[PDB]
Amino acid sequence: STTYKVATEADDVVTRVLFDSIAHHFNLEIEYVNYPSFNDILVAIETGNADFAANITYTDLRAQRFDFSRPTNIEYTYLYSYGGLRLPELRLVGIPKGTTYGTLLKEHYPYIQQVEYEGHLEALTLLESGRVDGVVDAINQLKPMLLKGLDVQLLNDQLPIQPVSIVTPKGKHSALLGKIEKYAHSAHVQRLLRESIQKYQLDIRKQALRQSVVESGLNVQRVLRVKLENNPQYALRGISADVVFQACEMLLLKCELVSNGQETWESMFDDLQDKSIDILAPITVSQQRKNLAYFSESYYHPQAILVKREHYKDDVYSNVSELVAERIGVIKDDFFEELLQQMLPNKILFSYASQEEKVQALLNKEVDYIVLNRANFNLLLREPIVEDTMIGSFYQYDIAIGFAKNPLGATLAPLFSRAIKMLNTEQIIHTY
Amino acid sequence: STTYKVATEADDVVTRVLFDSIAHHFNLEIEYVNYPSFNDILVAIETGNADFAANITYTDLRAQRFDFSRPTNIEYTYLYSYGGLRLPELRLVGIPKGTTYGTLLKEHYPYIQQVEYEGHLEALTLLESGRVDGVVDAINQLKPMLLKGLDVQLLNDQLPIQPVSIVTPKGKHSALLGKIEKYAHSAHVQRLLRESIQKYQLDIRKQALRQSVVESGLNVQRVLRVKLENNPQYALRGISADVVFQACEMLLLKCELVSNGQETWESMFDDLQDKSIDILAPITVSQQRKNLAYFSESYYHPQAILVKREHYKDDVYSNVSELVAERIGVIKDDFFEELLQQMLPNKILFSYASQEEKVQALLNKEVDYIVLNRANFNLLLREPIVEDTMIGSFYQYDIAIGFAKNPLGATLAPLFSRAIKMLNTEQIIHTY
Ligand SMILES: NC(=[NH2+])NCCC[C@H](N)C(=O)O
Ligand SMILES: NC(=[NH2+])NCCC[C@H](N)C(=O)O
Known part of the structure; x- marks a missing residue:
């Protein structure tokens, strides 16, 4: 009898889900070992103080220090930032040391300069009131980071984030790594990794978002009145309705779509300036209109x-x-x-x-x-x-959601921007 | 009897073509007046030391200093630079003072910083061995600038370059400006402005380019052998042939397309490494191939x-x-x-x-x-x-022309890059 030591950094939900699934399938004694930093994990592997580690991006240099399985899964990757910035908005970015992220950001955004750190506390102090504008790191940091009041932007559909694999001390667990590899690629486990991890991180991000709604102190019992533009102009029960409604679901607010006949001469924007409705979309954010309503970020x-x-x-x-x-x-x-x-x-x-x-x-x-x-x-x-x-x-040009110019709308609009970010807009757009 | 003073800066070919055409049509005595700078021209107008000027971009501020006709034509607009750079390659750019170009470049490339100048000599010294990386200016500068060994990139299909109009001392030549406006919009004059100006500037740019061929000292009597990839891979008598052949025409070199049957197992790249042909396209510039041939800039x-x-x-x-x-x-x-x-x-x-x-x-x-x-x-x-x-x-990814790795190919490839720039690639691509 023995015990396989598998490495973990912070909230390593994919290492837990994957190796629990493997432990059980092959009847293996797994033992998780917390490492305070990802590069701590790497040294543990080539050394031999740990038998397995996941979420390691394969490289040609790396394969000459310890041995790789073939990629087993994706890795959710986030920009952590106070406020929820984007990459092209930063001049400083924190970068986990030893990661593939050094190369990725200089290849796609060479002007930003990177500042290396070790582990979540180091990352957190850099962000927590520091010079760093934002940190790029894996799902491991998501739960503790959003606790500290940080926001994320999922980078995986923004940048080519390489798939990820299980790794082992070189020439060591050769046979076992093979069996682990083949099991991981199974229809079952793959379907399990797709959905449970997605569910897992989307829930953390919803919770942070919903806590913001509560902190905003807006009356979630209020039924928001929504109108959809139906005068031939730019877009529309399609793209705009899905984005608005699902964002309304994202925030656990209740929204009700309302219509009459209108409009070609009975503008809905008048209804918006009347404050007779709360939300109007689409609205193509002209200059003319830019000041007569509050606007979410664009979504088309x-x-x-x-x-x-x-x-x-x-x-x-x-x-x-x-x-x-x-x-x-x-x-x-x-x-x-x-x-x-x-x-x-x-x-x-x-x-x-x-x-x-x-x-x-x-x-x-x-x-x-x-x-x-x-x-x-x-x-x-x-x-x-x-x-x-x-x-x-x-x-x-840009299509956004417009909100009536009053205090409620001032609070709604930034919130709706976040709900829209977390959405899969591309899917909706396609659909239509 | 009298005389209308119309302003000109440098080689003002559109002012000449347009006002010769007008002078003759309305039987008007025109008198051109050289101004050493575009902003000199502007003061002449609102003042009244000049009766007309062309190529003035209309603005709301500007219409309160002197009076505008409606836009009468486009204005060819170039990045002048030693080597032929692009906008997103500069940190310093020279900017004609008084022009609309200040606003255009900060709106599209705010990081570059602008350095103002007055007239062609000032522009020329800034470029001519100075700190300025490149100057953005109108067709007025084309002929004298390319004389001084400068290259251009036409910016009109790169940036939204606003149309341009004829202008007049405020409340002055009101009736005459109307007649001039209506005549300029005529099918005839418009067709004349499109073609003769295009012909005019393309010829200056060809001449500069062809002088480079001659200065290269390559043997233009040599028939360049060309092959087109016909193994299903990326593109092809279509896009690639037009770009290669018309570039060959641009440079007054003679190119001959050659084929056999080949190729799926008889690679043309081998023919390129053999030096048995000189040019091969398309070739998708991998890493594998990056060093086995010389490459023009991409064209698709x-x-x-x-x-x-x-x-x-x-x-x-x-x-x-x-x-x-x-x-x-x-x-x-x-x-x-x-x-x-x-x-x-x-x-x-x-x-x-x-x-x-x-x-x-x-x-x-x-x-x-x-x-x-x-x-x-x-x-x-x-x-x-x-x-x-x-x-x-x-x-x-990128498609380029590949050239055999020998001295001739080393000289051809940069030349072919220029010929391709001056081409209308978008039109060819569409066509196919
Ligand atoms: N504990 C982590 N998954 N850290 C991030 C690793 C990032 C990337 N997969 C790499 O190995 O370079
Ligand atoms: N002589 C010239 N056309 N100079 C450039 C003028 C640029 C632009 N049309 C403007 O009036 O602001």
Whole structure:
């Protein structure tokens, strides 16, 4: 009889889940050993004070110090920061020593400078009131870090985070590592690692978020009134509804979608300025509108394109500045009218009351090019003209949630920004 | 009788072309007045020492100092630099004073710092052996600047360069400015401004480029032998042929495309290492290949995606790191094999001899996901499976022209980089 020592750093939930599963499947005596730092773990392995460790990114240098299994799983990787910053917002970043993260951040953000640390306390003091703007580290730090009032941004869908593997003192547990490898790749264990870990970390992040709601002292018994824009403009029970509602679920607030008939002349934004509703989306955050409501961070980025009569002047123009003498149709007070007024200063635009009228103008040769957002233009075709691929997307703008300009909305909007971050927006967008 | 004074700065070819055209059409006595600086021109206008000026970007502040016509034309705008740098490569940039360029560069590249100058000599000394890395200025500077051995990058398809207009002392030539405006927008004059100016500046840039060929001292009587990759891999008489051939035209070298049958086992790269041909494209600049040939700058950026059996495991995985236990098929020694070996370290990939065999493996359920480049995958469908939109483009890589590793190729490759810059690649790509 014996005992296999497997290394752990901080809250090593994947090492626990994986090796409990293995311990039990092969009837193995596992013994977890806490190491105060990830690089402590690495020395333990090549040395031999520990038999196994997980979550180690394989490298060519590394395979010459101790022996690797093939990658067994992903590793959730976060930017920890007071406020929830992004990578391209930092000039200092804390970096766990010995990790693959040194190379990753200099390869993708070489200007930031890294400051090395050892373990959670060191990381925590660097952040906890220090010079470091943010720390990049694994799921091991999530639970203790969010306790200390920190926020995260999941980096795995932001950067190519390499898969991860189980490792062993070189030439040591060769046969056992093989069996462990083959078991880990099984349909069962893989399905278990995907879901339980995702569930595990999303729950910690929800709890932190929900504690913020409570700390905000807003009345969660209040039914938030929501309106969705249904005047042909930019987007919509689709992308916007899912983001708003699921964010409302993220925060354990109750939201109710409300409608009448409206709107083409009965603006919902008026309802928002009335304070007769609390939330309105989508809203494309113009300049005109920027001050009349509070805004969540963006959650979609529409592609402005030009719609032209088919077969008309193809490849004559390669970008919209060369339309100096073409007739461009926009809708009055619409965001695209503003856009062109910046982009093509002092130029005559032709204004219309509606998309319908805007389109019919193009068809009647009243006008030659009209401004639409791509996704909306594809929609119209499904339910005789086309896009000028040459010019193509001449602009990318922002869609956000708007909140009524009062104290409640001031508190809601930053909260909704976080709920949106934690969402899988890409999936929703695809769906539609 | 009288005389209208219209302002000019340096080689103001658009002011000449436009106002000659107007002078003649309305029977007007024009008198050009050289101003040593663009901001000299502006003061002349609001003052009244000059009756007209062109190429002035309209602004809200500006319209309160002198009066604007509506935009009449675009303005070719260049980064001037020793070597031909790009904006995101500079920490210092020279900026003409009074221009719209101050605002444009800080809005798109705030980190660079601007250093103001007055006129071509000032600009030229800043560049000519100075601290400035590069100057951003209009077509006015093109001919004198390229004389002084400078290179350009056309910024108009790089940045939103606002259209441009004719301007006048405030409340002065009101009626005449109207007639001038309406004439300029005419089908005729517009067509004249598009083509003659484009022709004019492309010729100056060709001449500079061709002088470089001559200065290189390479034998332009030599017929360069070119091969195009025709083993299913990344791209191809299409994108690559147009870029290579038209670049060959750009440089007044003679290139001849050569083929046999080959190649799936008879690599053209071997022909390149043989020195039996001079040029090979496309070639996706791996690491494996990076040192065996000289490479032009990239001219296309393929989208690596995963091809999967239809209806199989949709939305189970959102990026390729989560394929740790899926069977991925690549071609042996292919670029994608290398890619995955970086991206999914120490993981078993299944290797094949060909695309054909790779595909049939996916169909035979030998394998579950295979790596293709998007454009190539669309091709196959046209002449039962699909892409995993969820993962989507998990990588963007580079396509370049490769040149044989000898002195001639060492000279050709940098030259071909310039010829490619001056090309309209977007148009070619579209076409295909
Ligand atoms: N205890 C940890 N998982 N620390 C982070 C490790 C990061 C990365 N997987 C590496 O081995 O370089
Ligand atoms: N002579 C010139 N065109 N100088 C550049 C002017 C740049 C820009 N059109 C402006 O008026 O601000």
